Amino acid sequence: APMNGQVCVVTGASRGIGRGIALQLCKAGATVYITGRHLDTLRVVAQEAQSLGGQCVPVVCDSSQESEVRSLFEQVDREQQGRLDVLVNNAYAGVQTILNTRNKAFWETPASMWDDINNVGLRGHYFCSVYGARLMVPAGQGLIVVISSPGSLQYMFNVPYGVGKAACDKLAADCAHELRRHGVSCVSLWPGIVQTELLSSAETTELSGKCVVALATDPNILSLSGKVLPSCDLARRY
Amino acid sequence: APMNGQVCVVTGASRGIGRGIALQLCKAGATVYITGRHLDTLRVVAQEAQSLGGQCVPVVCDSSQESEVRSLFEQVDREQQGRLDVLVNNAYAGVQTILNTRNKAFWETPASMWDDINNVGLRGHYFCSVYGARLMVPAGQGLIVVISSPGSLQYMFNVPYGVGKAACDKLAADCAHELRRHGVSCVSLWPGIVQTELLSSAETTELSGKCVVALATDPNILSLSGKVLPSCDLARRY
């Protein structure tokens, strides 16, 4: 199995893109830590993931809480003797809020809407990247994936969404910059939008997973580090 | 006086760029609300500002706290009968941390460093923009200025700094997009870096202020809305 012996962490894995990626990583033979706020939900994904192969470890982690993120990566370190190969920073937190407030302007919606979209979905990504990079850098290898979209380039849906996406693409680029000399890669993946109402999803989440497995097993992964990667192009590459 | 009758809010006004802008706005005859965590410090700036002209109103506001931002704009609404012409979203919060951690990588510094740079300096800007826009939109005019830098384009200093700057430039663009039909402008000003150790400052902070007065009194300001504006170019324009 291609990812036998490898260790992954996938955030926002209870549904959608994160769940699709967790499933493909386990299918490739990895041990995959999956996170979310609710253990029961994660266990159902884990049952399905582990059925495809590898191992799947539900961890309750609200990534808006730095101490919970620390706890997550302490567990990984403890259980895997410091090994971490792949971190997928993914968040569905806030997408439902985006949907509910369609066609309301940023001054019409509550100011706190920022936190529904850019806490777990930006701030949490930074926290995870810090703790994950701490495990990768000593090994001289590893891959951090930030899930983003064309909202990084232009107005899309609403203000906090687009600002968050600009920030996520930059997070990938700037982390890549610092990590390169240590042999660790960081990319921004645009897997396409699962929530089509925003704009098959089933097919799409599976494709996203296959892309992450492809990236994680590419000997030339460092050459893509710091780039934006549309998932459709990766399909063609691989 | 060019800005007689006008009402401004300048965040991070205790020193540096924010202080320079507050001073020039008062000199132009505006009423300027200035914010910060410490009233005593703000009062000293206000004494100097009000000496140049206009009026200067210190308001204690930790913009990481949404309820404090609400309170700030409630005061403005109450005291000025709903009038707000200019909001300058400016933050020096975190710059000293950037300096102290020079040449330490994002995984070497604490994860919480994100909050030193991108709480008041990103999240707070969103909160202020929401509450300020609520006052501007009914009037069909007004100007929101986001202070940013070339760190929006490329790696600069450290990860959270650059990510924050990418987010700030996007915040200006996306707010501009929604505001345009209501006649309200939003721009990203790159005034140059006051903290030169990062890379005269005195001259620079005064220039930044003069630029904001120029922008705020430009009948064609909407044509610049959504753009990045280097302060040196605005000098030439005005």
Side-chain angles (χ1 to χ4, degrees), chain B residues 159-189:
Chain B
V159 175
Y161 176 84
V163 172
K165 293 289 179 271
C168 289
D169 270 7
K170 187 53 146 59
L171 178 66
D174 285 358
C175 288
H177 181 262
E178 293 193 352
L179 287 165
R180 185 176 300 283
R181 72 186 302 269
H182 301 283
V184 179
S185 302
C186 182
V187 299
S188 174
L189 180 66

Side-chain angles (χ1 to χ4, degrees), chain A residues 1-10 21 24-26 28-32 83-88 136 141-145 183 185-187 189 207-222 224-225 229 234 237-238:
Chain A
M3 290 192 67
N4 183 53
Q6 302 202 34
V7 174
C8 307
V9 171
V10 180
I21 295 170
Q24 293 304 314
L25 288 170
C26 286
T31 295
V32 188
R83 182 169 185 154
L84 181 62
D85 297 289
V86 179
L87 167 62
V88 175
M136 298 184 178
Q141 65 193 28
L143 173 62
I144 306 172
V145 177
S185 302
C186 182
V187 299
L189 180 66
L207 165 60
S208 192
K210 289 166 179 163
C211 289
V212 177
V213 172
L215 291 168
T217 57
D218 189 338
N220 294 329
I221 185 50
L222 207 47
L224 304 174
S225 192
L229 305 176
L234 295 177
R237 168 179 178 92
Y238 300 110

